[PDB]
C-alpha cells in the first residue's frame, strides 16, 4: 500500500484527535479496527455523521486564514453524501442558500456531497461562490465583475446568457461524474437576498447605484477529513464588512468605484496627499455596514470581527489547542493597526481537517 | 580560524561584489589579497572610502523592511571613523542632525563611527533615535511617549530631569569604551525642526495641541558590511505620513489620540460600526501631510511612497538583482489594499551588507 497507507494514517490521526474531543475516547479501538478491514475491503472508508458533523468544524477551526473561526462550534453541516443526480444536486444548492439566508439572520452552514472515490470526483462544482456576478469584457469598458470574466465565458459556451447589466446572477454550473459537460440553472430571484448601497448621512450616495449579495458561499474548495477528500463542500458565513467595501467595490481589478465615490461624496480625487482614497474608502465601508444593518442581513464591521478573534485566541489556549494562523489574511484591509491581530504573529502551520484550494474544471 | 575565518569569507564576498557594480572588478584580486594579509596581521581589515560609502548603500538597499529603498544611491555617507572622544562623537551627532535636516528639505543620511574591534564596541549610542520624545509613568495618568520610558528612566537615573510635558526632547546618551557609565548632552532647540500638527479644513484641530519632530533618525542598529560591524552608525530619512498619523500619534500604547481626533472632527465615538477609528485615522494623517508640507519639512504619504517602491521593483529586475522585501513591513498601516505591494508577495531572505537588530545597553 501507498495511497491506501495514507489514508490509513490520516484516519489513526483523525479518529483519535475528533473521539478524543468528544469524550468518545474509549471507543477509538473498536472504529480504528473497523475502519482498517473497510480499507483492506473496499480501498476507502465511510465516515459516521459524527464523525463528519466534528471533521468539518474542525476543518473551519483550523482555516489559518479566517477571522470569523470564534464561531466554529456552531457550524451547521447537512450531510448529503446521498444525492446520485443533478436534480438532487442542484436542489441542495437551492436549499443551502435559502436555509443559509435565513430571511437576512444568516446561519454559517456547510453543505457535504459524495467524496472523490478513486480521485474520481462524484460531482465537480464550476462556480466559485454559490451567488456571484456575471463579469465581461467586449469593451465598451468592463461590465459587471472581472473576476468572473472566465467563468462567465464558459457559462456562454454552454448556451446561458447573461443581461449584460453589472450585476448579472451567474447560474448554478456543476458536471456529474460520467457526463462530458457541466449543467446550468439559473437561480431564482426570490432565494437570493441582495443589499441596495445608500449612506447614513449622504444623500447622494445612491447615484451610485451600488449593490451586493447578502451571502458568500464559497463553493469551489476540498474540505478533507481523516484522509477522506469532499471536493464538493459548499460553505458560508456572513460578510465583513470590509470585503465588501475595501475589495469587491474598490479594487482596481474588480468594481473599481472609488473616483466614483469620491466624487459623490463631494471631495476632489486629484492629490495622492489629500489620501482621497482613504477618505473614500471609509464612507463606502460605512456605506455598506449601515446598507445591511437597515435591511436586516447580517454583517459584521473589522473591529467587532477583529475582538472576536481574540476571544478565539484566548478559547485555543484555555482549551490546550496551539493556535494556527496567516496574518496576511487574518488582518483587515482597512486601519488594520487599529486591531489586536496586526501586533502580533501567528503560526502559519497546515493543521488537518482543512478546506483546500483545489483544480479549477475551466479556462 | 573560526572568528577570523568567518571576516575572510564575508570579505571575499562583498569585495567581489562591491567592486563588480563599481566596474573595479579586476582590481579585486590585489585587494583581497592585502586584506587577507592584514586579517593575518591584526585580526582584522579596513575598509577604503569607497567601498564604506558602496557598502552603506548597499545595506540600504537590502533592507528588506523599507519601502524608501528607491533612493538607495543617494544616501549621503559620513565617515567619521577618526573620532576618539566624547565631545568628536557628540559634534558628529549634532552635525548629522544638522545636515540630515538641511531647513526642512532633507537628506538621508547616515554617520559610520569606529567598528567594534573583538566585539568590543568604541562607542555604544543608548538613543533609539537620535531625536525623540521622553516618555513617563507616575501616572497621573502616562506623560509623553509611552515608547521612551526605559530609556528616561535611565537618564533620570544619571541625573538629567525632563519638564514632563508630552513632548520633552531626550538628550542624546552614548557611552565610550573604557567607560563604565555614559554621558548625556541636551539637544539644541535651534537644531531641532518641530511641526504643529493642523488640518487644512477643521480649524478646531489646533486644540488638540499635537505635534511631531521633523527627522527620524534611527541610531541604535548595526551596519554590517563585509564583516566588519559598525554598531554606532546612526542613519535618517523623511517621515512617511502614515508612521506619524497611523502609529506614533494613534497607537494605544502610543500617543493614543483617536477619541480626541474623533471629538474635535465632530463624529462620535460610540459604536464600532460607525467606522470612528478609520473616519479619524484619516483626518489626522491628512493633518500630518498638511502641517509638514505647509511648514517646508519633507514628508512622503503611503501612495506617493508605495509607487516610488513599485520603481524600485522594476529597477532591481532591470539590472539583474534578485530582489528581497517583508511583506508584513512594506504595507502601510492605512489603506494597504489601495497599493501594489498588498496584492503581491515578496522574498525575505537576508541579504548582507544590512543593518541589524543589537541589545540595548539598558534596561
Ligand atoms: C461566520 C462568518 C465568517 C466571517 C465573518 C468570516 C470572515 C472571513 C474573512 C474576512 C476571510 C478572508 C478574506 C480576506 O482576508 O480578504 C475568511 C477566509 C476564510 N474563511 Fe471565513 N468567515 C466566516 C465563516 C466561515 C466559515 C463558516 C468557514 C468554513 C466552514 C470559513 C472558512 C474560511 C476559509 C477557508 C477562508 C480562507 C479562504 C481562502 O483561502 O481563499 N469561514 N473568513
Ligand atoms: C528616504 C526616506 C525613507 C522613507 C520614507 C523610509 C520609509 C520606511 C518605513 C515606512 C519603514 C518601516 C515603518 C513601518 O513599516 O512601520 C522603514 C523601515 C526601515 N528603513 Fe526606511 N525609509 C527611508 C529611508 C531610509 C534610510 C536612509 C535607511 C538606511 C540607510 C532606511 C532603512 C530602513 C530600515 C533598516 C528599516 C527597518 C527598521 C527596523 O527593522 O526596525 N530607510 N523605512
Ligand atoms: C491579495 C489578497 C490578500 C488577501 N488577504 N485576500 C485576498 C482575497 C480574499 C478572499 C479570497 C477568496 C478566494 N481565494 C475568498 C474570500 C472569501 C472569504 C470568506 C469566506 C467565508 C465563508 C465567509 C467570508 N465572510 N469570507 C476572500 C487577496
Ligand atoms: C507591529 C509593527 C508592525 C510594523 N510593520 N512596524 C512596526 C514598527 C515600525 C517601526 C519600528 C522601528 C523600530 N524597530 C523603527 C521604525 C522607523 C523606520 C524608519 C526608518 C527611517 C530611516 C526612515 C523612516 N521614515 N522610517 C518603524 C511595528
Same mark, same amino acid.
Given at each position: 500500500?501507498?495511497?491506501?497507507?495514507?489514508?490509513?494514517?490520516?484516519?489513526?490521526?483523525?479518529?483519535?484527535?475528533?473521539?478524543?474531543?468528544?469524550?468518545?475516547?474509549?471507543?477509538?479501538?473498536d472504529?480504528?479496527?473497523?475502519?482498517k478491514?473497510? =480499507?483492506?475491503?473496499?480501498?476507502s472508508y465511510?465516515?459516521?455523521?459524527? &464523525?463528519?458533523?466534528?471533521?468539518?468544524?474542525m476543518?473551519?477551526?483550523?482555516?489559518?486564514?479566517?477571522?470569523?473561526?470564534?464561531?466554529?462550534?456552531?457550524?451547521?453541516?447537512?450531510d448529503?453524501?446521498?444525492?446520485?443526480?443533478?436534480?438532487?444536486?442542484?436542489?441542495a444548492?437551492?436549499?443551502?442558500? &435559502?436555509?443559509?439566508?435565513?430571511?437576512?439572520?444568516?446561519?454559517?452552514? =456547510?453543505?457535504?456531497?459524495?467524496?472523490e &472515490?478513486?480521485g474520481?470526483?462524484?460531482?465537480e462544482?464550476?462556480?466559485?461562490?454559490?451567488?456571484?456576478?456575471?463579469?465581461?469584457?467586449?469593451?465598451?469598458?468592463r461590465?459587471?465583475?472581472?473576476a468572473?470574466?472566465?467563468?462567465?465565458?464558459?457559462?456562454? &459556451?454552454?448556451?446561458?446568457?447573461?443581461?449584460?447589466?453589472?450585476?448579472?446572477?451567474?447560474?448554478?454550473?456543476?458536471? $456529474?461524474?460520467?457526463?462530458?459537460?457541466?449543467?446550468?440553472?439559473?437561480?431564482?430571484?426570490?432565494?437570493?437576498?441582495?443589499?441596495?448601497?445608500?449612506?447614513?448621512? =449622504?444623500?447622494?450616495?445612491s447615484?451610485?447605484?451600488?449593490?451586493?449579495?447578502?451571502?458568500?458561499?464559497?463553493?469551489?474548495?476540498?474540505?478533507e477529513?481523516?484522509?477522506?477528500?469532499?471536493?464538493?463542500?459548499?460553505?458560508?458565513?456572513w460578510? $465583513?464588512?470590509?470585503? =465588501?467595501?475595501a475589495?469587491?467595490?474598490?479594487?482596481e481589478?474588480?468594481?473599481?468605484?472609488?473616483?466614483?465615490?469620491?466624487?459623490?461624496?463631494?471631495?476632489?480625487?486629484?492629490?495622492?496627499?489629500?489620501?482621497?482614497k482613504?477618505?473614500?474608502?471609509?464612507?463606502?465601508?460605512?456605506?455598506?455596514?449601515?446598507?445591511?444593518?437597515?435591511?436586516?442581513?447580517?454583517?459584521?464591521?473589522?473591529?467587532?470581527?477583529?475582538?472576536?478573534?481574540?476571544?478565539?485566541?484566548?478559547?485555543?489556549?484555555?482549551?490546550?489547542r496551539?493556535?494556527?494562523?496567516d496574518?496576511?489574511?487574518?488582518?483587515?484591509?482597512?486601519?488594520?493597526?487599529?486591531?489586536?491581530?496586526?501586533?502580533?504573529?501567528?503560526?502559519?502551520?497546515?493543521?488537518?481537517?482543512?478546506?483546500?484550494?483545489?483544480?479549477?474544471?475551466?479556462?
Amino acid at each position: 500500500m501507498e495511497e491506501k497507507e495514507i489514508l490509513w494514517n490520516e484516519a489513526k490521526a483523525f479518529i483519535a484527535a475528533c473521539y478524543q474531543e468528544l469524550g468518545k475516547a474509549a471507543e477509538v479501538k473498536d472504529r480504528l479496527a473497523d475502519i482498517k478491514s473497510e =480499507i483492506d475491503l473496499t480501498g476507502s472508508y465511510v465516515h459516521t455523521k459524527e &464523525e463528519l458533523e466534528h471533521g468539518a468544524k474542525m476543518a473551519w477551526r483550523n482555516s489559518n486564514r479566517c477571522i470569523g473561526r470564534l464561531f466554529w462550534n456552531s457550524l451547521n453541516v447537512i450531510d448529503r453524501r446521498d444525492v446520485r443526480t443533478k436534480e438532487e444536486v442542484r436542489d441542495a444548492l437551492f436549499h443551502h442558500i &435559502e436555509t443559509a439566508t435565513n430571511n437576512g439572520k444568516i446561519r454559517p452552514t =456547510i453543505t457535504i456531497f459524495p467524496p472523490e &472515490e478513486k480521485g474520481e470526483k462524484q460531482v465537480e462544482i464550476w462556480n466559485h461562490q454559490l451567488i456571484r456576478y456575471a463579469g465581461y469584457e467586449s469593451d465598451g469598458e468592463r461590465i459587471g465583475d472581472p473576476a468572473s470574466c472566465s467563468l462567465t465565458a464558459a457559462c456562454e &459556451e454552454l448556451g446561458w446568457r447573461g443581461e449584460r447589466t453589472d450585476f448579472d446572477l451567474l447560474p448554478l454550473i456543476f458536471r $456529474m461524474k460520467g457526463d462530458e459537460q457541466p449543467v446550468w440553472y439559473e437561480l431564482p430571484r426570490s432565494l437570493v437576498i441582495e443589499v441596495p448601497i445608500t449612506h447614513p448621512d =449622504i444623500e447622494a450616495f445612491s447615484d451610485l447605484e451600488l449593490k451586493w449579495y447578502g451571502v458568500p458561499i464559497i463553493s469551489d474548495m476540498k474540505l478533507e477529513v481523516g484522509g477522506i477528500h469532499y471536493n464538493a463542500a459548499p460553505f458560508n458565513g456572513w460578510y $465583513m464588512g470590509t470585503e =465588501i467595501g475595501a475589495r469587491n467595490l474598490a479594487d482596481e481589478k474588480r468594481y473599481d468605484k472609488l473616483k466614483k465615490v469620491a466624487s459623490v461624496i463631494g471631495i476632489a480625487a486629484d492629490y495622492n496627499t489629500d489620501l482621497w482614497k482613504d477618505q473614500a474608502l471609509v464612507e463606502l465601508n460605512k456605506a455598506v455596514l449601515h446598507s445591511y444593518k437597515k435591511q436586516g442581513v447580517s454583517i459584521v464591521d473589522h473591529h467587532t470581527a477583529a475582538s472576536q478573534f481574540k476571544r478565539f485566541e484566548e478559547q485555543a489556549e484555555e482549551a490546550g489547542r496551539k493556535l494556527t494562523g496567516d496574518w496576511t489574511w487574518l488582518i483587515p484591509p482597512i486601519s488594520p493597526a487599529a486591531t489586536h491581530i496586526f501586533h502580533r504573529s501567528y503560526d502559519n502551520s497546515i493543521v488537518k481537517p482543512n478546506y483546500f484550494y483545489q483544480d479549477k474544471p475551466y479556462e
